RNA sequence: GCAAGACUAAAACUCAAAUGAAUUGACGGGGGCCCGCACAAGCGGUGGAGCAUGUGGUUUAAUUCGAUGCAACGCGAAGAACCUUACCUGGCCUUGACAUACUAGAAACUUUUCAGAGAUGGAUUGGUGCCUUCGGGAACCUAGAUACAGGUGCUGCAUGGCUGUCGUCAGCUCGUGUCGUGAGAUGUUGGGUUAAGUCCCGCAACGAGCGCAACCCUUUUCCUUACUUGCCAGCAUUUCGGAUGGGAACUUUAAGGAUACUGCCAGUGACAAACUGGAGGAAGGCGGGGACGACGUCAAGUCAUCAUGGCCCUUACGGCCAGGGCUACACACGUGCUACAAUGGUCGGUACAAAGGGUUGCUACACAGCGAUGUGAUGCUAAUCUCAAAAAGCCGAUCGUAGUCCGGAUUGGAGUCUGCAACUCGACUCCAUGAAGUCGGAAUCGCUAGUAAUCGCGGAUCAGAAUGCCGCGGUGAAUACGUUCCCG
């Protein structure tokens, strides 16, 4: 990938991070039912009014040595060509050649 | 046609694994990628320490890290001050305390790695490629290896058309799974571009399975 | 195993969890004190209840 | 094959009447796997012949299918024991599949006894390999 | 010479060859031999219909790029509403979103807003921290400067690495000695046998390696260890629920072992290698399946995973943002799903699996709703709780061959959930609608046994989004006379 991509990716789960209390406030007082529907309509308006890149939904998992985008594989977190050349060196625990 | 890792092919026949440590899923990832750093690292800094194997175990709340190596007084320092910057380096990467362990390779020449590195290092200074094969495979077959193949592939010479030219003495049977047979490729960086050599050393058939490794 | 197009051309890996489970009844005063000095070995993580 | 014979696959007797030609013709009915679909229609068959006329449901269908069997291929061949039986049951099959009644089961046990006295698709299919046969 | 023509017989000009014999390959509509779902014998499909998906073309501001006979076309992509995104329109930045080297100042950070589509820009709070030989330093931020960064821009015909294909084809080589002026040959050929250059015989050859087989995983029989969260044969109590005392037998779980070796008998082979039949045994001659792919070939594929020689851009071919596109639609092709019904559709009742997933998660149970779901609540970090209903099956009723009580496309109207946001462009639910389709030309594809056919279940990717892909079990066939031709 290039490197503003991966700079991207990067300031993405900065700003998810920095945003991620505050959202999950606004959204149990959405969801309480004790509160005012006035109340609940402010919570939806801010949540609304809340940054995009604090969204979890725009994060893109990306290998964690080259930052492809396509077969991720979330137990090892690495694409699918490092994933092999490492398996096939030896240098993850456990993982061997399938044949049954 | 393309042929199996023989280190992958036996990682549970007759070889082990370079780590040694269990995860849940949840930490699986974080582990295998300060791992996975932690070897680039120590790649790049003991570039001249003639360092082949390294081995990283986390026993408990902790790590480990085996370097067997053909000069462990360099890799030591002079003394001992090295080892404790590699081990605050290792442990600021990895999060943990550390601890190195040294491991000294005796036979150079039995050591796929150590060999690919040797002939990289010619090529890299224009030493003629059929020479520093010949000179590798000599060399290994004296030092008591039962085979080995040599093999290097791209512009060899500087010619503008690559190609790739190997020399086997002894036995190599890559076909038996219990056979020992350490592999190893290196890349050699010249003005014309990147010349590729794999090696393959063939130490003799492995008795007993992994029960007499002992897994 | 190709970096560009071949769908049959693939690696089939698979990892194992083995598990084991050990009871000790009627534990002495040493057999607490012999467990917590025991090693631990890498590559097995040992969950001890009470 | 090529070169070797490959070993006649023995089928077990069926587990009511042990008659491997009961068993092979529910195999020549059955699809796609429903083994007790075919059973149902075969048995059925062989009930209910038996009550419209007292014979043995073994022995009636085994006369009948002597009475189906061809003997002749097509260049003149005969053609062997087991391709007679083959043959047979597929005529029988196809033949039954297109008279018109409520069940499978019915058409089959119809077309048995039309067969048994001499009308039927498939003993017409029989006199078409005579004929053909007798054309060389 | 009647003629057709015969005989004698040049030069100009032009090329760097033209030839003979023999050697190694390749090919032959030359000859011998052998194998393979190659044919033959069978059972199901495709090509016809509707829909899903990929490609070509066309269209467009853009419809991003790559893959192109077999060996591209449900391929990279294990999952495009924003993001991804690489493309287009418009708005912005310039040593830069990111690194090293230099010079100065600030802890870093944090609150409230305002303008704007956002990127951005401006006002406005608190905090001003950690070490200290303490004169300053550690991060971290801002300002200046220039070497530079950056580039999914070009070259896979400069390359590494990785992969496909012939092809799981049985071949491919080397040393000493002999023969030949020589390239070369011999060995490796010759007779049987095998799934195999597998093995046994002969021979100017005598000796070795990589290939084949075996070693590795899984399944079938048994034994030992182990007795919980799993099991319940015998005893006892029971709300008849292994529920409870209890038991270690059995099932199972999973580590280690045993067994199969032509071992025994009969017949043949050649008096060898081998081959056919029989007993015992769970299993008999390779029991079944997986992984493993020789020397090489195609300037095969990939500079868009990554690395890398060379070329090119540098207020732009770099970087940030909002909206659009990758989802277009007179058409053509490939791969699929669902059907055309009675061996079936619908309704009522009632059985039997395996494997895998679950703490930002799976959810017992209750209530509300026709339903998708919502609320409350419970157990579970799991042989403990849960996804979970297996479905085809069996019993009963009904439909009676009709474009139908078949089929389920399309469209109208209401909703639910994920998500900042379902217009372009999501999945699912309810009511209404009810298209083509009556078994599909030439041609062509898969499959030799727990296989084909048919039925359901799970997972990777993943907020949501599978008819694809990778796995799991249930029911369970037909036919192989043979090598005459089709192909390799
Ligand atoms: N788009 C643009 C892609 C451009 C391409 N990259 C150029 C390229 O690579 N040129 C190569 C190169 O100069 C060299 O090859 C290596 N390896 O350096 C050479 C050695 O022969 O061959 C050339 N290629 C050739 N092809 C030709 C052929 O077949 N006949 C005639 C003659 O034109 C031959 N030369």
Redesign the pocket.
Known sequence: ?????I??EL??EKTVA?YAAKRAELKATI?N?NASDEERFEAMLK??A???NA????L??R?GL??????????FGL????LRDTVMQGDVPGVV?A?? | ????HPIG?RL??VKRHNANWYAN??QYAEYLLKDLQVREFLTKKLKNAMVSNILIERPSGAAKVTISTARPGIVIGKKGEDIEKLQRELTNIMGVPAQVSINEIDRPDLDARLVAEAIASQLEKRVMFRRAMKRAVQNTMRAGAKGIKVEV???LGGA???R?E?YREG????????ADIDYA?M?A?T??????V?VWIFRGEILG?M?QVMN | ?????????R??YEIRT??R?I?IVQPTDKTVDALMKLDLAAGVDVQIAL | ???R??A??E?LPDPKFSSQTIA?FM????????????E??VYGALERVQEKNKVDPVEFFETTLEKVRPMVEVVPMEV?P??RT?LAM?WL?DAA?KRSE???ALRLAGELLDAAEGKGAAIKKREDVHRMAEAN
């Open positions: 990938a290039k490197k503003g991509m700079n991207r300031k993405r920095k969801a039912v949540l609304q809340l940054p995009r969204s979890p939904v725009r893109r998992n290998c080259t930052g492809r985008p396509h077969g991720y594989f979330r137990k694409s699918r060509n490092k050649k044949s049954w | 046609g393309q042929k199996v092919i549970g026949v899923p949840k592939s791209g512009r503008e058309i690559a790739t190997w036995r190599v049977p890559l076909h038996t799974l219990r490729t890349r960086e003005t014309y571009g990147t010349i590729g794999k399975g029960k | 195993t190709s970096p560009h197009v071949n769908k049959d051309a690696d089939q083995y598990k489970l009871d | 094959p090529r070169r014979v490959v006649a696959r089928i092979k195999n020549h009915v059955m699809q796609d796997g429903k083994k007790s679909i075919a149902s229609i062997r087991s391709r083959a597929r099959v599949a409520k069940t499978m």
